[PDB]
């Protein structure tokens, strides 16, 4: 009983514009037809404008069904699916709540591969970025088993002010980066952005009260490159927050494979209650990468938004556990959690880094494997295994309760653990060499012996 998009005129040849047919299918499903189920037979469905998902609709695409992004409009977004209306810039409308939407199967060709000059998207010369989904003010949205290809310096998915969103068993292949782009713009392009709902981060609607995203889970998915464009810059995260935005919360990133990202597998500021668990982060050498960042990378990077005037709600309750890191690039850091500047007024707290396995065989590593900078309270770094590199764990300028218990180190060339504090002008240890533990007793710190050493 699922309605076929062919029932409404979709040709599926990649030449005819099938947008209207697809929209009519969705609209009918939203009314109740076919139980809200829409089906996509094998084929290539070109769309020259945005398709709008509606409440209680469920799209299923054949394995050989491909949605081709043909949205090439000046001063206009090039995102295939949205959960709210959009016409032209300057005519945005408020997006009302939507819910119970599912999308499964097939491929979405965001069509962002570069022209031979590498200055623009070859098939969409007028766009500034391309993506697949713009999910805003939505509830209970499920995206699964979808292959996303060639984003033109954009977000494959944006989840803003949305609750109960699941991205599962999908593949994010390739992100095109043109010659002309600056680093500032580049690192702000996460393939899956999870953010509060503001016009700044979600210019597709008028909603501007900073509604948070909540209960978002990205799991069992693969992130890498395609045969047309290089590795993604940042797989998941966000890069913006203000006193007026509510922090996305209960964000779970589980069992994903981040295959050689250029900057980070996970990077964010302004999240609360995050769980990054059982993921695999691989990083190859510059020579085997299409995209490479000279400035370096940090596979997991929970940082603080640059702001010295406001007391922001910086990252809190972040758990980084049981992840595996295979690093070959000497400029790549495995894990980083920080309040980047002593000038930031907010606080980073309740940080847990446990049972992670770091395999660093890069030559002459240029930085620590695990960096914890200015955590204000409740920091736990325990039972992590680090194979290779220079420094193992660096804890700098952290306050409050700190617990570092039974981590393992093998074949390291530098200090296993560095517990550092600074004064208004310089640096000195809080209290050191080899493997040991740190505990907080009555507000005070103390090194404790543990007999776990490398005998390789
Ligand atoms: Ca969580
Ligand atoms: Cl939970
Ligand atoms: Mn339009
Ligand atoms: Mn956004
Ligand atoms: Mn944005
Ligand atoms: Mn490229």
- Count up the domains in the chain and report the number: 1
CA of 250 to the centre of ligand 2 (A): 6
Among the bound ligands, the one closest to the CA of 19: 3
Instruction: Return d(Cα 237, Cα 228) in angstroms, integer.
Output: 24
Q: How many CA atoms within 13 Å lie on the side-chain side of 78?
A: 29
Among the bound ligands, the one closest to the CA of 160: 4
Instruction: Return d(Cα 367, Cα 394) in angstroms, integer.
Output: 10
Instruction: Return d(Cα 101, Cα 297) in angstroms, integer.
Output: 35
Q: Which residue has the tokens 């010295």?
A: 308
Instruction: Return d(Cα 90, Cα 95) in angstroms, integer.
Output: 15
Among the bound ligands, the one closest to the CA of 136: 4
Q: Which residues contact 291 (CB under 8 A, 6 or more apart)?
A: 175, 177, 225, 230, 231, 233, 262
Cross-strand pairs, 94 = none
Among the bound ligands, the one closest to the CA of 194: 4
CA of 81 to the centre of ligand 4 (A): 14
Cβ atoms of residues 346 and 339 within 8 Å: yes
Q: Which residues surround ligand 3, an ion (CB under 5 A)?
A: 87
Q: Which residue has the tokens 């009918």?
A: 28
Q: Is the dihedral of CA 203, 206, 209, 211 positive or negative?
A: negative
Cβ atoms of residues 303 and 338 within 8 Å: yes
Instruction: Return d(Cα 399, Cα 31) in angstroms, integer.
Output: 57
Structure solved via: X-ray
CA of 401 to the centre of ligand 5 (A): 35
CA of 75 to the centre of ligand 3 (A): 10
Tokens of 419: 């517990």
CA of 208 to the centre of ligand 4 (A): 12
CA of 136 to the centre of ligand 4 (A): 10
Structural domain range at position 20: 1-456
CA of 123 to the centre of ligand 4 (A): 23
Find the CATH number of the domain harbouring 222: 2.160.20.10
CA of 193 to the centre of ligand 5 (A): 8
CA of 161 to the centre of ligand 4 (A): 10
CA of 101 to the centre of ligand 4 (A): 20
> 222 phi and psi, to 5 degrees?
-110, 140
CA of 256 to the centre of ligand 2 (A): 18
CA of 78 to the centre of ligand 1 (A): 31
CA of 109 to the centre of ligand 6 (A): 15
Burial class (CB within 10 angstroms; exposed 0-12, middle 13-18, buried 19+) of 367: middle
What are the angstrom distances between the C-alpha of 382 and each of 155, 238, 386, 405, 409? 34, 27, 11, 5, 12
Q: Which residues contact 229 (CB under 8 A, 6 or more apart)?
A: 112, 113, 114, 150, 151, 174, 175, 176, 177, 290
Q: Which residues surround ligand 5, an ion (CB under 5 A)?
A: 201
CA of 170 to the centre of ligand 2 (A): 22
Task: Give 21-26's long-range contacts (Cβ < 8 A, gap of 24+).
Answer: 22/47, 22/51, 23/51, 23/52, 26/51, 26/52, 26/53, 26/54, 26/57, 26/59
Question: C-alpha angle with apex 152: 229 to 13, nearest 5 degrees?
Answer: 85
CA of 248 to the centre of ligand 4 (A): 13
CA of 46 to the centre of ligand 6 (A): 23
CA of 324 to the centre of ligand 1 (A): 19
CA of 275 to the centre of ligand 2 (A): 9
CB atoms within 10 A of CB 308: 9
Among the bound ligands, the one closest to the CA of 85: 3
């Amino acid at each position: 009983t699922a309605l076929s998009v062919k029932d409404y005129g979709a040709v599926g040849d990649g030449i005819h514009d099938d947008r209207q047919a697809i929209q009519d299918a969705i609209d009918a499903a939203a009314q109740g037809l076919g139980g809200g189920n829409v089906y996509f037979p094998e084929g290539t469905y070109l769309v020259k404008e945005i398709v709008f998902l509606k409440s209680h609709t469920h799209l299923e695409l054949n394995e050989k069904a491909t949605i081709l992004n043909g949205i090439n409009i000046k001063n206009h977004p090039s995102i295939v699916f949205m959960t709210g209306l959009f016409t032209d810039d300057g005519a945005q409308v408020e997006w009302g709540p939507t819910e119970d939407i599912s999308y499964s199967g097939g491929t979405i060709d965001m069509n962002g591969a570069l022209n031979e000059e590498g200055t623009k998207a070859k098939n969409l010369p007028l766009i500034n970025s391309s993506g697949a989904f713009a999910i805003g003010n939505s509830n209970n949205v499920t995206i699964k088993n979808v292959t996303f290809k060639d984003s033109y310096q954009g977000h494959a998915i944006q989840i803003a002010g949305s609750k109960n969103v699941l991205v599962d068993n999908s593949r994010f292949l390739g992100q095109a980066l043109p010659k002309t782009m600056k680093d500032g713009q580049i690192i702000s392009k996460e393939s899956i952005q999870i953010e509060p709902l503001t016009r700044k981060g979600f210019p597709y609607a008028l909603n501007d009260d900073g509604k948070k995203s909540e209960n978002v889970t990205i799991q069992n998915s693969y992130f890498g490159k395609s045969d047309k464009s290089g590795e993604l810059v940042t797989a998941i995260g966000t890069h913006y927050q203000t006193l007026s935005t509510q922090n996305p919360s209960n964000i779970k990133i589980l069992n994903n494979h981040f295959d050689n990202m250029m900057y980070a597998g996970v990077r964010f500021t302004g999240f609360t209650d995050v769980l990054i668990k059982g993921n695999r982060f691989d990083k190859k050498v510059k020579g085997e990468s299409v995209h490479y960042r000279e400035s370096g990378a940090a596979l997991v990077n929970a940082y603080s938004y640059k702001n010295t005037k406001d007391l922001l709600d910086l990252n809190k309750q972040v758990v980084i556990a049981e992840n595996i890191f295979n690093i070959a690039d000497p400029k790549t850091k495995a894990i980083r959690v920080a309040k980047d500047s002593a000038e930031y007024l907010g606080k980073v707290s309740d940080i847990t880094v446990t049972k992670n396995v770091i395999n660093n065989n890069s030559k002459e590593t240029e930085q620590p494997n695990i960096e914890l900078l200015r955590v204000s309270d409740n920091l736990v770094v325990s039972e992590n295994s680090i194979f290779g590199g220079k420094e193992g764990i660096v804890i700098e300028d952290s306050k409050g309760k700190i617990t570092v218990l039974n981590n393992q180190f093998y074949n390291l060339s530098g200090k296993y653990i560095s517990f550092i504090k600074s004064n208004a002008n310089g640096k000195e240890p809080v209290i050191s060499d080899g493997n040991f533990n740190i505990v907080t007793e009555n507000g005070l710190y103390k090194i404790v012996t543990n007999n776990l050493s490398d005998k390789n």
